[PDB]
A paper describes a structure:
The L-arginine biosynthesis pathway consists of eight enzymes that catalyse the conversion of L-glutamate to L-arginine, appears to be attractive target for anti-Tuberculosis (TB) drug discovery. The arginine biosynthesis pathway consists of eight different enzymes ([Fig fig1]) all considered to be essential for *[name]* growth *in vitro*. In this work, the ligandability of four enzymes of the pathway [name], [name], [name] and [name] is explored using a fragment-based approach. In conclusion, using a fragment-based approach, we have discovered inhibitors that bind to novel sites in [name] and [name] and to the active sites of [name] and [name], which in case of [name] show on target activity against *[name]*.
Soaking [name] with fragment hits yielded eight crystals structures. All fragments occupied a site at the interface between two protomers of the [name] trimer but not all sites are equally occupied by all fragments ([Fig fig4] and S2B-F). This site contacts directly with the α-helix 2 and sits between this helix and α-helix 3 of the opposing protomer. The site is formed by residues thr51, arg52, phe55 of α-helix 2, leu265, ala289, arg292 of protomer 1 and ile45, ser75, thr76, leu78, glu82, thr87, leu91 and tyr94 of protomer 2. These residues form a cavity that opens to the carbamoyl phosphate binding site. Binding of fragments at this site, slightly shifts the position of α-helix 2 by 1.9 Å, when compared to the carbamoyl phosphate structure, and also affects the conformation of arg52 which is involved in carbamoyl phosphate binding. Fragments were found to bind in two distinct sub sites across the main binding site and could be divided in three different groups based on their mode of binding. All fragments keep α-helix 2 in a position close to the apo structure or move further away from the position this helix occupies when carbamoyl phosphate is bound, albeit very slightly. In the case of [name], its close proximity to the active site shows potential to develop compounds that can anchor at the interfacial site and then extend towards the active site, thus inhibiting the enzyme. Nevertheless, while the [name] active site is conserved, the interfacial site of [name] contains several differences that raise the prospect of developing specific inhibitors for the *[name]* enzyme.
Residue numbers in the entry:
A (entry chain B): 1 to 74, 77 to 227, 239 to 307
B (entry chain A): 0 to 307
C (entry chain C): 1 to 307
Write the structure that this text describes.
């Protein structure tokens, strides 16, 4: 009966809508929900450090009344079985937030822990970032369903997979614009196409950056790590092809002049700074929502 | 009032230990009902060698007492390197209401405690692990009731921190403690004599034997621990062959009382000191035991702060 | 506008007095001010770790009702994977203040130029202005009014404590003397800024290699370690030049009979200061160490309400 959140499609379309609505309420009233008052603990474990993931989660948990126990990459599983660690953590904390690499490690922890496990960021998915992206799109553009989103650059990385899955879950027509060596994992693509039939969305994968941008409502990129990606740069030429009032997203950090140009990132279509803040609100909502169902 | 420290299990008298364990039971039922550190007031939690389960239990426990744990890993300069230990203790005493320290040699804890003007707690050391044994006693009481007169046997390395603390903390609770260990691996003589003298006051006893089967027979509680600490991996000994007859396995457990329970200071190395069947079977109390580090350490801190 | 505290003369004499008054009030009532209730966040960022800096700030923020997010060395150093400007914009969305221990002053200036929350220099190569606030609180509680006191600092005259004692000291009206050997003198820009500020407060600046003249008639004697970790490979013999400037019993006996002794910890007993001086009746190093908690909480309270 314990819900986990390891990939974007772990939420149904109706569940994802609940979490995003909660994120909006929490942005307006950040200390109104105190499910962890006590404080109750939440584990925030990094197999590899991520300062942005730490600020977001550590502050968010505290604003829910809890105390985050942050374990930096100075690992889980060397000492004892992941199953034994999961059993003990379940006695100390009400949720486990974990940044690890392979998906099989997250699945293993989730199969044994008796508290919710959240994928903070992994090799294959970045589902919390995409919740923050969807919150940012909704507050700038309103209804998500039927919007057109294009992601540019490395189509094999965790953002491309999560934009496909979380995007179609929200009714967004998602396009990935990527060069040949760097396309979405085929099982993720197939999961996105199936979910997309439930929401009226669709999946497109192309090497044509110009067609990806033409008519886009949301344009997204991410760092590249490098010649194959240059045609996919978000520059101002690409952005003129989009629909009026298009918004640009980029989970930070950005390498200005590589995947994105100053003019795009500092211009009026950029929503990168609101996007960064909304990681706090979206992750708090996810936690609140998981905790009440577990 | 004198400042009370908790560096070894016998730092509590039998009556004082009973007060702490009763408070641990109350705190398990009502975990935010005691707020002596409301403010927050600080508590230092220092690791000369990192321990992640010591971290979760103390960091959360201190927060639930209303306090704020300042957690210092060994990534900082080891205490005693950049400035004297006495200088550090004097400064710490201006910032925090208690000092929790995982360190190696017991003389370092003694030194800190002699100069600090706030309680010092041994979170785990080479010679003792008294906080773990408080959690063990809480767990035993939960399962069996009165501790006085129970029979507890520990198996494996008889000179490690858990053997020493089970001796001292166990006899302080009135438990008849047996250590089953091979020759060359027997309890420190000073700790054994201290346990024998304390056991006189409680009606307990101390037994040390190389006969694992005899130690298991009639026991109410069977305990083991890893055979080798990190610092012993390079000591030159074969640290498998001497201990294999002391494995806590189904055969050994079946020799004990039908109602016996099994304890183990985590992490366990399954297949070495304990088997999967025992670890995962119905006699195992290891998960409740791990949880009770939280409650027993909170009780200890509440009790020390009130007396200091 | 947003106020920052990057060096000691970022506070005017009147503003410094307000922060020091607040520090005394917070020492008496340490949880009575809750500007960060929520909790609101405060970033505490270390380009190079300092355990003493971390404890003081982490507890202080919590006692203001906030939650400190501590970033130790081990994260990618600010500037490596992203512009300081971009990091500052994102930080400003998460926290109500940025406390940063870094190296060159230009990095602090850059952060403060674009951050929309107060930026505090926790400790840097050029200045240690939070420690000097704690020193001034310590002197005030031991001596009363600061104006007109005579303070002499001994040792490396170009380190961050020498620079902040000059600037923070003259801001408080203290006559500051730096006693240091040739080649280890205060930065000229810092000395000139102190000399300008001293005209406003009736204070004065003296730089001298004459250790006995600097101790004579002093109300406060201060020293610091002769070498920072980043100076250990600079090629200099960093012991012989400084031995004449040791804060020892003979040097203390030249000062005013009611003189006090300060040293931001840790001390290397036997080098810059002796056991007899560290542990005798003139030493105020333990109160000084504690007051870093109260002075830093005061600064945060004051910056948060002005910004
Ligand atoms: C939410 O993330 C942050 O606030 C953040 C990002 C990058 C940084 O280098 C630092 I320090 C903080
Ligand atoms: C109470 O102890 C724990 O919850 C714990 C133990 C071991 C670990 O490796 C980790 I991550 C957490
Ligand atoms: C405020 O500074 C301290 O309290 C402190 C200083 C040095 C240390 O090694 C440790 I642990 C704490």
């Amino acid at each position: 009966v314990i819900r986990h959140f390891l990939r974007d499609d772990d939420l149904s379309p109706a569940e994802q809508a609940e979490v995003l609505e909660l994120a909006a309420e929490l942005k307006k009233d950040p200390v109104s929900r105190r499910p962890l008052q006590g404080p109750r603990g939440v584990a925030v474990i990094f197999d590899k450090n991520s300062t942005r993931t730490r600020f977001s989660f550590e502050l968010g948990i505290a604003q829910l009344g809890g105390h985050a126990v942050v374990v930096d990459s100075g690992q889980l599983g060397r000492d004892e079985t992941l199953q034994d660690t999961a059993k003990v953590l379940s006695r100390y904390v009400d949720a486990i937030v974990w940044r690890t690499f392979g998906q099989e490690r997250l699945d293993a922890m989730a199969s044994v822990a008796t508290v919710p496990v959240i994928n903070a960021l992994s090799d294959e998915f970045h589902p919390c970032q995409v919740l923050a992206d969807l919150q940012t799109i909704a507050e700038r553009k309103g209804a998500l369903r039927g919007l057109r989103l294009s992601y540019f650059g490395d189509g094999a990385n965790n953002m491309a997979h999560s934009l496909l899955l979380g995007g179609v879950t929200a009714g967004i027509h998602v396009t990935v614009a990527a060069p040949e060596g760097f396309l979405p994992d085929p099982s993720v693509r197939a999961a996105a196409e199936r979910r997309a039939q439930d929401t009226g969305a669709s999946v497109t994968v192309t090497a044509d950056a110009h067609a990806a941008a033409a008519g886009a409502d949301v344009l997204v990129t991410d760092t590249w790590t490098v010649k194959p990606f240059r045609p996919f740069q978000l520059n101002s030429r690409l952005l003129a092809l989009a629909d009026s009032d298009a918004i640009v997203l980029h989970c930070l950090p950005a390498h200005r002049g590589d995947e994105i140009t100053d003019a795009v990132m500092d211009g009026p279509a950029s929503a990168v700074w609101d996007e960064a803040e909304n990681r706090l609100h979206a992750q708090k909502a996810l936690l609140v929502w998981l905790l009440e169902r577990s």
